[PDB]
Amino acid sequence: VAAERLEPRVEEKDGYWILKEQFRKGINPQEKVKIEKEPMKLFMENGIEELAKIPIEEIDQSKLTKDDIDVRLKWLGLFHRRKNQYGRFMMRLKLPNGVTTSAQTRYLASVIRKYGKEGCADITTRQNWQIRGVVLPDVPEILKGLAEVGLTSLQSGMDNVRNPVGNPLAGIDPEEIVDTRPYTNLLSQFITGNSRGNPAVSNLPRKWNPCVVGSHDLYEHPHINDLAYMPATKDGRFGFNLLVGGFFSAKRCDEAIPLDAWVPADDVVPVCRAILEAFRDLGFRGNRQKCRMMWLIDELGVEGFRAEVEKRMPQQQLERASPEDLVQKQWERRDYLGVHPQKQEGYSFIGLHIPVGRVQADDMDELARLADEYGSGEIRLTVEQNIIIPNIETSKIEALLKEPVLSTFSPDPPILMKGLVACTGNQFCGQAIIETKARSLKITEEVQRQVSLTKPVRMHWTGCPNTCAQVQVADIGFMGCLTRDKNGKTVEGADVFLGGRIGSDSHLGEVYKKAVPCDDLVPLVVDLLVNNFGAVPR
């Protein structure tokens, strides 16, 4: 790699970071959108106030404003559902470590309730909330309401640092390695500039996923993050070994690799900043399929990339990885659904199944009520799109288990439901090839009616090759496609994936059988379960 390749390609100008004049040749259309107008201005200079007043039909008549609502608004966490729910916006939060309060949950419920049949909410595969039904004129008030309850939606889409994932059992599990909440909180504060916006990290070449590990179970999926912090003691000091570059895409899926770097626990934010600065400064900005950070690491080599991180650290110090980390490889991933004792004597948490992560306003209010009556007003989200209510006095559990709402959001659903994960799909997502959430529930119910099993088989349904529902981590994955029935008629189908393993012995699954009509999946899946996962026909 020539020295010229290492010249930073962006510069700070008037509070924002912009591509230098000589580094604009050959850039992709999204890079052009970012040059034409700085997306962060919609929040940081309150551009949204006047934009929200323009009728959407008028907005669509000019490129600048159409790009504002379809692209730039994703820096404020607002996602126009142009194709499938025209004129409505999904809104996505920052929710480090998946932690919410009952007051926040009620606020979110109040927003979606206004929109009737156009509103609902979802738990995401980054243990985050999305709300639906939002209309542009309401955006300024919703932004204010979020701030009022201590939430932000900043920088949650497009070329930004995505939700910091941590251990859903942080602070409460007897078996935790280290409480991840202080670290994910710090990362979210850094990323969003304490909810004011942080332009230094909002003009990346592409999305970028961080997580902090605190569990032997590796609930945080460090192998598929751009930056994963692996807890490790080095020379008698607590800190983290760093994994970099994990990502999924239509073109390529790759597990994170060692940076060969250890940082003291206090250097979590400094090293996140250094890595993001290197990616921002040096990453390719052409073909969008080749802009994730792993492509930079491959171009420079991991050592070349490491040197770029090192030079951006305070005092330019970046120690080599600790020979061992704290994660025990002898481990069986633990079910968190149901009632479990906390490390705090006399307290339990309860994991509740949320079928395919989908809730309505009334459901959110009920869950918030349970969290207040039984817990400490806290609701935790998981990356399997479930919930945990922590800090419940154990003597209250008997009463809790009788609550009517638990017949719907159950502490002990059938085993295949416990592991079921499904993305948005074509109900709302414009890229989706198939419907996912209703279909996945229907097929899973039919499969479980036919077989019993004891292995915790994890089934993931994703609607298109973007693989937001991570089919490559599943025991059995389903990637949406169009295919043909016996008569040659167009039907919805799935490409079926096998081989995904999570935890310390992680492995990426691969296509097993392409183009299976969705109507033909039940017998295929039943046989796979019997033949490979010890399932027994009923």
**Annotated binding-site residue numbers:** 81, 124-126, 128, 130, 132, 206-207, 209, 248, 289, 292, 385, 423-424, 429, 464, 468, 470
Q: How far apart are CA 241 and CA 324, in angstroms?
A: 9
Q: Are 240 and 229 in contact (CB under 8 A)?
A: yes
Q: Which residues are registered as beta bridge partners of 94?
A: 152
430 is a site residue for Cl ion (CB under 5 A): yes
425 is a site residue for ligand SF4 (CB under 6 A): yes
Residue 191 contacts by C-beta under 8 Å, 6 or more apart in sequence?
94, 154, 155, 160, 161, 164, 198, 201
| Minimum distance from residue 123 beta carbon to ligand SF4 (Å) | 13
Instruction: Classify residue 260 as left (phi > 0), alpha (psi -120 to 50) or beta.
Output: left
Q: Which of 39, 157, 239, 480 binds ligand SRM (CB under 6 A)?
A: 157
Q: Which is nearer to ligand SRM, 124 or 241 (CB)?
A: 124
Q: Which is nearer to ligand SRM, 41 or 292 (CB)?
A: 292
Q: How far apart are CA 538 and CA 519, in angstroms?
A: 21
R_g of the chain computed on alpha carbons: 23
| Minimum distance from residue 116 beta carbon to ligand SRM (Å) | 18
Q: How far apart are CA 181 and CA 63, in angstroms?
A: 41
466 is a site residue for ligand SRM (CB under 6 A): yes
Select from K ion, ligand SRM, Cl ion, none the partner in contact with residue 82, using the beta carbon and a kind-dependent cut-off of 5 to 8 Å: Cl ion
Burial of 442 by CB count in 10 Å (0-12 exposed, 13-18 middle, 19+ buried)? middle
Paired tokens of 389: 């209510």
158 is a site residue for Cl ion (CB under 5 A): yes
Task: Give the DSSP letter of residue 205.
Answer: S
- Which stretches of the chain bind ligand NO2, using CB under 6 A? 157, 207, 468
Q: How far apart are CA 379 and CA 109, in angstroms?
A: 14
430 is a site residue for ligand SRM (CB under 6 A): yes
66 is a site residue for Cl ion (CB under 5 A): no
468 is a site residue for ligand SRM (CB under 6 A): yes
Q: How far apart are CA 136 and CA 321, in angstroms?
A: 48
The residues in 260-299 that bind ligand SRM, with binding defined as CB under 6 A, are 292
Q: Which of 111, 191, 416, 432 binds ligand SF4 (CB under 6 A)?
A: 432
| Minimum distance from residue 295 beta carbon to ligand SF4 (Å) | 20
Question: Per the annotation, where are the binding residues for siroheme?
Answer: 81, 124-126, 128, 130, 132, 206-207, 209, 248, 289, 292, 385, 424, 429, 468, 470
Q: Which of 424, 444, 470, 472 binds ligand SF4 (CB under 6 A)?
A: 424
Q: Which is nearer to ligand SF4, 413 or 480 (CB)?
A: 480
Q: Which of 217, 470, 516, 529 binds ligand SRM (CB under 6 A)?
A: 470
| Minimum distance from residue 159 beta carbon to ligand SF4 (Å) | 16
Q: CA separation (Å) from 196 to 11, 275, 410, 500?
A: 20, 21, 38, 39
448 is a site residue for ligand SRM (CB under 6 A): no
Paired tokens of 138: 């309401």
Q: Which amino acid is at 208?
A: W
477 is a site residue for ligand SF4 (CB under 6 A): no
Q: Which of 253, 464, 473, 476 binds ligand SF4 (CB under 6 A)?
A: 464
Measure the CA angle with vertex 211, ends 361 and 217; round to 5°.
Answer: 90
92 is a site residue for ligand SRM (CB under 6 A): yes
The secondary structure of 296-359 as a DSSP string is HHHHH-HHHHHHHHHHTSGGG--BPPPSS-S--SS--PPP-SEEEE-SSTTEEEEEE--GGGEE
| Minimum distance from residue 120 beta carbon to ligand SRM (Å) | 11
Q: Which is nearer to Cl ion, 74 or 437 (CB)?
A: 74
Select from ligand SF4, Cl ion, K ion, none the partner in contact with residue 157, using the beta carbon and a kind-dependent cut-off of 5 to 8 Å: Cl ion
Question: Per the annotation, where are the binding residues for [4Fe-4S] cluster?
Answer: 423, 429, 464, 468
Determine the residue with CB nearest ligand SF4. Answer: 463
| Minimum distance from residue 71 beta carbon to K ion (Å) | 30
Paired tokens of 463: 């609607």
The residues in 83-112 that bind Cl ion, with binding defined as CB under 5 A, are 83
Residue 519 contacts by C-beta under 8 Å, 6 or more apart in sequence?
485, 491
423 is a site residue for ligand SF4 (CB under 6 A): yes
User: Tokens 């010890």 belong to which residue?
Assistant: 534
The secondary structure of 107-173 as a DSSP string is HHHHHHHTTGGG-EEEE-TTS-EEEEEE-GGGHHHHHHHHHHTT-B-TT-SSSSB---B--TTTTT-
Q: How far apart are CA 345 and CA 514, in angstroms?
A: 51
102 is a site residue for ligand SRM (CB under 6 A): no
Q: Which residues bind Cl ion (CB under 5 A)?
A: 82-83, 157-158, 430
Q: Which residues bind ligand SRM (CB under 6 A)?
A: 79, 90, 92, 122, 124-126, 128, 130, 156-157, 162-163, 207, 209, 224, 247-249, 292, 423-424, 428-431, 466-470
Q: Which residues bind ligand SF4 (CB under 6 A)?
A: 423-425, 429, 431-432, 462-464, 466-469
